[PDB]
Amino acid sequence: GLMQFTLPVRLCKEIELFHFDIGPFENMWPGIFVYMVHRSCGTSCFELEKLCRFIMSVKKNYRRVPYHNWKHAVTVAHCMYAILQNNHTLFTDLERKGLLIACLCHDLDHRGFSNSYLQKFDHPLAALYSTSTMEQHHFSQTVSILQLEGHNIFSTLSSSEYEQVLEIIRKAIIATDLALYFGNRKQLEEMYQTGSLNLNNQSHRDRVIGLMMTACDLCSVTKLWPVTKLTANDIYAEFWAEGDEMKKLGIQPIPMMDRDKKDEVPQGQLGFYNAVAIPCYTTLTQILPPTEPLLKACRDNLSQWEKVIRGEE
Ligand SMILES: Cn1ncc(C(=O)N2CCC2)c1C(=O)Nc1ccn(C2CCCC2)n1
Numbered sequence: 001g002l003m004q005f006t007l008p009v010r011l012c013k014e015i016e017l018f019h020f021d022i023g024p025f026e027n028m029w030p031g032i033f034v035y036m037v038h039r040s041c042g043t044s045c046f047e048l049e050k051l052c053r054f055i056m057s058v059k060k061n062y063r064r065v066p067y068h069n070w071k072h073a074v075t076v077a078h079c080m081y082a083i084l085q086n087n088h089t090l091f092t093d094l095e096r097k098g099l100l101i102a103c104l105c106h107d108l109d110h111r112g113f114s115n116s117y118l119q120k121f122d123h124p125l126a127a128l129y130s131t132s133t134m135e136q137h138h139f140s141q142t143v144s145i146l147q148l149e150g151h152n153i154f155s156t157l158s159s160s161e162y163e164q165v166l167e168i169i170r171k172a173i174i175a176t177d178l179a180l181y182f183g184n185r186k187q188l189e190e191m192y193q194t195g196s197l198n199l200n201n202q203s204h205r206d207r208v209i210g211l212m213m214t215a216c217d218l219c220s221v222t223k224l225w226p227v228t229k230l231t232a233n234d235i236y237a238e239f240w241a242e243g244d245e246m247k248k249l250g251i252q253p254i255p256m257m258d259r260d261k262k263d264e265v266p267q268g269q270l271g272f273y274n275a276v277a278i279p280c281y282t283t284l285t286q287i288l289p290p291t292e293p294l295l296k297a298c299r300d301n302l303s304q305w306e307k308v309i310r311g312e313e
Protein backbone atom coordinates (compact mmCIF):
# COMPACT_ATOMS: atom_id res chain seq x y z
CA GLY A 1 0.00 0.00 0.00
CA LEU A 2 2.92 2.40 0.87
CA MET A 3 4.84 1.54 -2.42
CA GLN A 4 4.57 4.43 -4.96
CA PHE A 5 6.05 4.11 -8.44
CA THR A 6 8.23 7.17 -9.30
CA LEU A 7 9.77 8.28 -12.58
CA PRO A 8 13.00 10.17 -13.22
CA VAL A 9 12.40 13.95 -13.00
CA ARG A 10 12.12 14.55 -16.82
CA LEU A 11 9.50 11.78 -17.21
CA CYS A 12 7.75 12.87 -13.99
CA LYS A 13 7.19 16.40 -15.44
CA GLU A 14 6.68 15.52 -19.12
CA ILE A 15 4.19 12.58 -18.53
CA GLU A 16 1.55 15.22 -17.55
CA LEU A 17 1.74 16.81 -21.05
CA PHE A 18 -0.48 15.62 -23.92
CA HIS A 19 2.54 15.32 -26.31
CA PHE A 20 4.68 13.04 -24.04
CA ASP A 21 6.42 10.16 -25.92
CA ILE A 22 6.80 6.98 -23.74
CA GLY A 23 10.34 6.40 -25.16
CA PRO A 24 12.29 3.52 -26.75
CA PHE A 25 12.90 1.47 -23.50
CA GLU A 26 10.17 -1.32 -23.46
CA ASN A 27 10.95 -2.36 -19.84
CA MET A 28 9.82 1.08 -18.50
CA TRP A 29 6.36 1.05 -20.21
CA PRO A 30 4.67 -1.21 -17.57
CA GLY A 31 5.83 1.09 -14.73
CA ILE A 32 4.80 4.17 -16.76
CA PHE A 33 1.29 2.61 -17.04
CA VAL A 34 1.16 1.77 -13.29
CA TYR A 35 2.43 5.28 -12.35
CA MET A 36 -0.50 6.70 -14.41
CA VAL A 37 -3.07 4.39 -12.64
CA HIS A 38 -1.79 5.44 -9.14
CA ARG A 39 -2.07 9.22 -9.98
CA SER A 40 -5.33 8.93 -12.02
CA CYS A 41 -7.24 6.37 -9.93
CA GLY A 42 -5.26 6.04 -6.60
CA THR A 43 -2.78 3.50 -5.01
CA SER A 44 -5.89 1.43 -3.90
CA CYS A 45 -7.83 0.92 -7.26
CA PHE A 46 -6.03 -2.41 -8.02
CA GLU A 47 -4.10 -5.10 -6.05
CA LEU A 48 -0.50 -4.43 -7.27
CA GLU A 49 0.24 -8.30 -7.39
CA LYS A 50 -2.82 -8.64 -9.81
CA LEU A 51 -2.35 -5.38 -11.82
CA CYS A 52 1.28 -6.44 -12.62
CA ARG A 53 0.09 -9.92 -13.70
CA PHE A 54 -2.68 -8.36 -15.90
CA ILE A 55 -0.27 -5.87 -17.58
CA MET A 56 2.25 -8.66 -18.50
CA SER A 57 -0.49 -11.04 -19.86
CA VAL A 58 -1.76 -8.09 -21.98
CA LYS A 59 1.82 -7.26 -23.11
CA LYS A 60 2.28 -10.96 -24.06
CA ASN A 61 -0.94 -10.92 -26.24
CA TYR A 62 0.08 -7.90 -28.42
CA ARG A 63 2.11 -9.05 -31.47
CA ARG A 64 5.37 -7.66 -32.96
CA VAL A 65 3.75 -5.74 -35.83
CA PRO A 66 5.10 -2.33 -36.94
CA TYR A 67 2.32 -0.17 -35.42
CA HIS A 68 -0.60 -2.05 -33.69
CA ASN A 69 1.77 -3.23 -30.93
CA TRP A 70 2.40 -2.95 -27.16
CA LYS A 71 3.96 0.56 -27.60
CA HIS A 72 0.66 1.71 -29.25
CA ALA A 73 -1.30 0.22 -26.29
CA VAL A 74 0.64 2.31 -23.71
CA THR A 75 0.76 5.47 -25.89
CA VAL A 76 -3.06 5.32 -26.26
CA ALA A 77 -3.41 4.78 -22.43
CA HIS A 78 -1.16 7.82 -21.69
CA CYS A 79 -3.33 10.15 -23.86
CA MET A 80 -6.42 8.99 -21.88
CA TYR A 81 -4.38 9.69 -18.68
CA ALA A 82 -3.68 13.29 -19.85
CA ILE A 83 -7.37 13.76 -20.75
CA LEU A 84 -8.56 12.39 -17.34
CA GLN A 85 -6.02 14.51 -15.32
CA ASN A 86 -7.04 17.74 -17.13
CA ASN A 87 -10.81 16.95 -16.61
CA HIS A 88 -10.54 15.64 -13.02
CA THR A 89 -14.13 16.20 -11.78
CA LEU A 90 -16.28 15.23 -14.87
CA PHE A 91 -15.45 11.48 -14.49
CA THR A 92 -16.58 8.85 -11.95
CA ASP A 93 -14.22 6.51 -10.01
CA LEU A 94 -15.29 3.53 -12.26
CA GLU A 95 -14.74 5.54 -15.48
CA ARG A 96 -11.09 6.39 -14.57
CA LYS A 97 -10.51 2.63 -13.71
CA GLY A 98 -12.22 1.23 -16.90
CA LEU A 99 -10.92 3.73 -19.50
CA LEU A 100 -7.12 3.41 -18.83
CA ILE A 101 -7.58 -0.41 -18.93
CA ALA A 102 -9.80 -0.10 -22.08
CA CYS A 103 -6.97 1.90 -23.75
CA LEU A 104 -4.25 -0.62 -22.68
CA CYS A 105 -6.41 -3.52 -24.08
CA HIS A 106 -8.06 -1.78 -27.10
CA ASP A 107 -5.87 -3.43 -29.85
CA LEU A 108 -5.15 -6.84 -28.08
CA ASP A 109 -3.95 -9.59 -30.55
CA HIS A 110 -4.10 -7.27 -33.62
CA ARG A 111 -2.46 -8.90 -36.69
CA GLY A 112 -1.91 -5.52 -38.46
CA PHE A 113 -4.84 -5.74 -40.98
CA SER A 114 -8.15 -3.83 -41.33
CA ASN A 115 -11.66 -5.32 -40.75
CA SER A 116 -11.97 -4.95 -44.63
CA TYR A 117 -9.01 -7.35 -45.24
CA LEU A 118 -10.37 -9.97 -42.73
CA GLN A 119 -13.66 -9.90 -44.75
CA LYS A 120 -12.04 -10.12 -48.24
CA PHE A 121 -9.74 -12.93 -46.94
CA ASP A 122 -12.81 -14.61 -45.30
CA HIS A 123 -11.00 -14.93 -41.91
CA PRO A 124 -13.00 -16.87 -39.26
CA LEU A 125 -13.25 -13.75 -36.99
CA ALA A 126 -15.29 -12.11 -39.91
CA ALA A 127 -17.82 -15.06 -39.77
CA LEU A 128 -18.01 -14.77 -35.91
CA TYR A 129 -18.36 -10.86 -35.81
CA SER A 130 -19.97 -9.23 -38.89
CA THR A 131 -19.13 -5.57 -37.93
CA SER A 132 -16.33 -4.02 -35.82
CA THR A 133 -14.62 -7.45 -36.33
CA MET A 134 -11.19 -6.80 -34.77
CA GLU A 135 -12.75 -4.55 -32.07
CA GLN A 136 -15.17 -7.27 -30.79
CA HIS A 137 -12.15 -9.67 -30.88
CA HIS A 138 -10.13 -7.17 -28.72
CA PHE A 139 -12.88 -6.99 -26.06
CA SER A 140 -13.16 -10.87 -26.17
CA GLN A 141 -9.37 -11.16 -25.56
CA THR A 142 -9.67 -8.59 -22.67
CA VAL A 143 -12.40 -10.67 -20.86
CA SER A 144 -10.26 -13.88 -21.45
CA ILE A 145 -7.21 -12.28 -19.76
CA LEU A 146 -9.34 -10.85 -16.88
CA GLN A 147 -10.53 -14.49 -16.22
CA LEU A 148 -7.00 -16.08 -15.88
CA GLU A 149 -6.46 -17.23 -12.19
CA GLY A 150 -4.86 -14.20 -10.37
CA HIS A 151 -5.62 -11.65 -13.19
CA ASN A 152 -9.06 -10.27 -12.14
CA ILE A 153 -7.91 -6.71 -11.23
CA PHE A 154 -11.65 -5.81 -10.73
CA SER A 155 -12.50 -8.63 -8.21
CA THR A 156 -12.79 -6.00 -5.35
CA LEU A 157 -15.80 -4.14 -6.99
CA SER A 158 -19.47 -5.07 -6.18
CA SER A 159 -21.37 -7.31 -8.69
CA SER A 160 -22.99 -4.13 -10.24
CA GLU A 161 -19.82 -1.95 -10.28
CA TYR A 162 -18.18 -5.01 -12.00
CA GLU A 163 -20.98 -5.13 -14.65
CA GLN A 164 -20.79 -1.31 -15.19
CA VAL A 165 -16.96 -1.35 -15.64
CA LEU A 166 -17.10 -4.22 -18.25
CA GLU A 167 -19.87 -2.30 -20.13
CA ILE A 168 -17.73 0.95 -20.06
CA ILE A 169 -14.69 -1.06 -21.45
CA ARG A 170 -16.81 -2.88 -24.15
CA LYS A 171 -18.30 0.42 -25.45
CA ALA A 172 -14.85 2.09 -25.19
CA ILE A 173 -13.15 -0.64 -27.28
CA ILE A 174 -16.00 -0.87 -29.87
CA ALA A 175 -15.79 2.97 -30.29
CA THR A 176 -12.12 2.55 -31.50
CA ASP A 177 -13.69 1.18 -34.76
CA LEU A 178 -13.18 4.30 -36.98
CA ALA A 179 -16.26 3.33 -39.16
CA LEU A 180 -18.44 4.23 -36.09
CA TYR A 181 -16.39 7.45 -35.31
CA PHE A 182 -17.97 9.61 -38.14
CA GLY A 183 -21.63 9.36 -36.99
CA ASN A 184 -20.63 9.45 -33.28
CA ARG A 185 -18.91 12.85 -33.80
CA LYS A 186 -21.71 14.19 -36.15
CA GLN A 187 -24.25 13.48 -33.28
CA LEU A 188 -21.99 15.11 -30.60
CA GLU A 189 -21.59 18.19 -32.91
CA GLU A 190 -25.45 18.47 -33.38
CA MET A 191 -26.03 17.83 -29.61
CA TYR A 192 -23.47 20.51 -28.48
CA GLN A 193 -24.55 23.15 -31.13
CA THR A 194 -28.34 22.76 -30.33
CA GLY A 195 -27.41 22.82 -26.56
CA SER A 196 -29.10 19.38 -25.90
CA LEU A 197 -25.73 17.82 -24.72
CA ASN A 198 -26.30 16.58 -21.09
CA LEU A 199 -23.54 14.53 -19.34
CA ASN A 200 -26.05 12.94 -16.84
CA ASN A 201 -27.62 11.28 -19.91
CA GLN A 202 -25.73 7.88 -19.94
CA SER A 203 -26.16 7.58 -23.78
CA HIS A 204 -24.53 11.08 -24.12
CA ARG A 205 -21.59 10.13 -21.82
CA ASP A 206 -21.16 6.94 -23.92
CA ARG A 207 -20.80 9.14 -27.10
CA VAL A 208 -18.29 11.49 -25.31
CA ILE A 209 -16.26 8.48 -24.02
CA GLY A 210 -16.29 7.25 -27.68
CA LEU A 211 -14.78 10.53 -28.96
CA MET A 212 -12.15 10.42 -26.16
CA MET A 213 -11.15 6.84 -27.31
CA THR A 214 -10.90 7.92 -31.05
CA ALA A 215 -8.84 10.99 -29.83
CA CYS A 216 -6.42 8.80 -27.74
CA ASP A 217 -6.16 6.23 -30.60
CA LEU A 218 -5.10 8.84 -33.24
CA CYS A 219 -2.79 10.68 -30.78
CA SER A 220 0.37 9.96 -32.89
CA VAL A 221 -0.76 13.11 -34.92
CA THR A 222 -0.64 15.26 -31.68
CA LYS A 223 3.12 14.56 -30.90
CA LEU A 224 6.34 16.51 -31.73
CA TRP A 225 6.81 16.44 -35.53
CA PRO A 226 9.69 13.84 -35.48
CA VAL A 227 7.45 11.38 -33.42
CA THR A 228 4.43 11.97 -35.73
CA LYS A 229 6.56 11.53 -38.86
CA LEU A 230 8.42 8.35 -37.65
CA THR A 231 5.11 6.73 -36.41
CA ALA A 232 3.52 7.28 -39.91
CA ASN A 233 6.32 4.98 -41.36
CA ASP A 234 5.02 2.27 -38.99
CA ILE A 235 1.42 3.11 -39.98
CA TYR A 236 2.23 2.93 -43.77
CA ALA A 237 4.34 -0.26 -43.17
CA GLU A 238 1.12 -2.13 -42.14
CA PHE A 239 -0.99 -0.36 -44.87
CA TRP A 240 1.49 -1.44 -47.61
CA ALA A 241 1.67 -5.04 -46.21
CA GLU A 242 -2.19 -5.03 -46.36
CA GLY A 243 -2.07 -3.70 -49.96
CA ASP A 244 0.40 -6.50 -50.83
CA GLU A 245 -2.02 -9.12 -49.37
CA MET A 246 -4.96 -7.56 -51.34
CA LYS A 247 -2.93 -7.95 -54.62
CA LYS A 248 -2.25 -11.60 -53.54
CA LEU A 249 -6.09 -12.12 -53.44
CA GLY A 250 -6.09 -10.55 -57.02
CA ILE A 251 -7.63 -7.19 -55.82
CA GLN A 252 -6.12 -3.71 -56.57
CA PRO A 253 -5.87 -2.06 -53.12
CA ILE A 254 -6.87 1.62 -52.55
CA PRO A 255 -3.80 3.86 -53.37
CA MET A 256 -3.41 4.61 -49.58
CA MET A 257 -2.24 0.94 -49.23
CA ASP A 258 -0.33 0.49 -52.56
CA ARG A 259 3.46 0.63 -51.89
CA ASP A 260 3.93 1.74 -55.57
CA LYS A 261 2.13 5.09 -54.67
CA LYS A 262 4.44 6.33 -51.80
CA ASP A 263 4.68 9.72 -53.71
CA GLU A 264 0.91 10.25 -52.81
CA VAL A 265 1.54 9.84 -48.96
CA PRO A 266 1.75 13.55 -47.88
CA GLN A 267 -1.55 14.29 -49.81
CA GLY A 268 -3.12 11.16 -48.07
CA GLN A 269 -2.08 12.59 -44.66
CA LEU A 270 -3.82 15.91 -45.68
CA GLY A 271 -7.09 14.04 -46.35
CA PHE A 272 -6.76 12.13 -43.02
CA TYR A 273 -5.98 15.30 -40.92
CA ASN A 274 -8.84 17.28 -42.64
CA ALA A 275 -11.43 14.41 -42.82
CA VAL A 276 -10.64 12.64 -39.46
CA ALA A 277 -8.11 14.12 -36.97
CA ILE A 278 -8.89 17.91 -37.02
CA PRO A 279 -12.68 17.35 -36.71
CA CYS A 280 -12.04 14.76 -33.90
CA TYR A 281 -9.95 17.11 -31.72
CA THR A 282 -12.16 20.15 -32.64
CA THR A 283 -15.38 18.52 -31.26
CA LEU A 284 -13.36 17.21 -28.23
CA THR A 285 -12.02 20.74 -27.49
CA GLN A 286 -15.63 22.10 -27.77
CA ILE A 287 -16.90 19.43 -25.31
CA LEU A 288 -13.78 19.24 -23.04
CA PRO A 289 -12.06 22.64 -23.21
CA PRO A 290 -8.83 21.67 -21.40
CA THR A 291 -8.01 19.19 -24.31
CA GLU A 292 -7.19 22.21 -26.61
CA PRO A 293 -3.43 21.30 -26.74
CA LEU A 294 -4.33 18.08 -28.74
CA LEU A 295 -6.13 20.30 -31.35
CA LYS A 296 -3.23 22.85 -31.45
CA ALA A 297 -0.57 20.06 -31.88
CA CYS A 298 -2.66 18.33 -34.58
CA ARG A 299 -2.94 21.62 -36.62
CA ASP A 300 0.85 22.22 -36.29
CA ASN A 301 1.42 18.70 -37.74
CA LEU A 302 -1.06 19.22 -40.68
CA SER A 303 1.06 22.32 -41.34
CA GLN A 304 4.27 20.18 -41.25
CA TRP A 305 2.59 17.82 -43.86
CA GLU A 306 1.76 20.83 -46.09
CA LYS A 307 5.47 21.84 -45.73
CA VAL A 308 6.56 18.30 -46.87
CA ILE A 309 4.51 18.66 -50.15
CA ARG A 310 5.72 22.22 -50.96
CA GLY A 311 9.19 20.51 -50.94
CA GLU A 312 10.22 22.50 -47.73
CA GLU A 313 11.08 19.11 -45.99
C1 LIG B 1 -2.01 8.77 -39.35
N1 LIG B 1 -2.94 7.78 -38.83
N2 LIG B 1 -3.14 7.48 -37.53
C2 LIG B 1 -4.08 6.50 -37.50
C3 LIG B 1 -4.50 6.14 -38.85
C4 LIG B 1 -5.47 5.08 -39.26
O1 LIG B 1 -6.43 5.33 -39.99
N3 LIG B 1 -5.42 3.76 -38.89
C5 LIG B 1 -4.92 3.13 -37.67
C6 LIG B 1 -6.18 2.19 -37.73
C7 LIG B 1 -6.57 2.84 -39.10
C8 LIG B 1 -3.78 7.05 -39.68
C9 LIG B 1 -3.80 7.32 -41.16
O2 LIG B 1 -2.80 7.75 -41.79
N4 LIG B 1 -4.98 7.10 -41.80
C10 LIG B 1 -5.12 7.49 -43.15
C11 LIG B 1 -4.05 7.83 -44.10
C12 LIG B 1 -4.72 8.05 -45.33
N5 LIG B 1 -6.08 7.84 -45.09
C13 LIG B 1 -7.18 7.93 -46.05
C14 LIG B 1 -8.59 8.04 -45.37
C15 LIG B 1 -8.92 9.53 -45.46
C16 LIG B 1 -8.04 10.16 -46.58
C17 LIG B 1 -7.02 9.12 -47.05
N6 LIG B 1 -6.34 7.57 -43.79
Ligand SMILES: [Mg+2]
Nearest residue numbers: 106107134176
Ligand atom coordinates in the same frame (compact mmCIF):
# COMPACT_ATOMS: atom_id res chain seq x y z
MG1 LIG C 1 -7.81 -0.97 -33.35
Ligand SMILES: [Zn+2]
Nearest residue numbers: 072106107217
Ligand atom coordinates in the same frame (compact mmCIF):
# COMPACT_ATOMS: atom_id res chain seq x y z
ZN1 LIG D 1 -5.45 1.55 -31.68
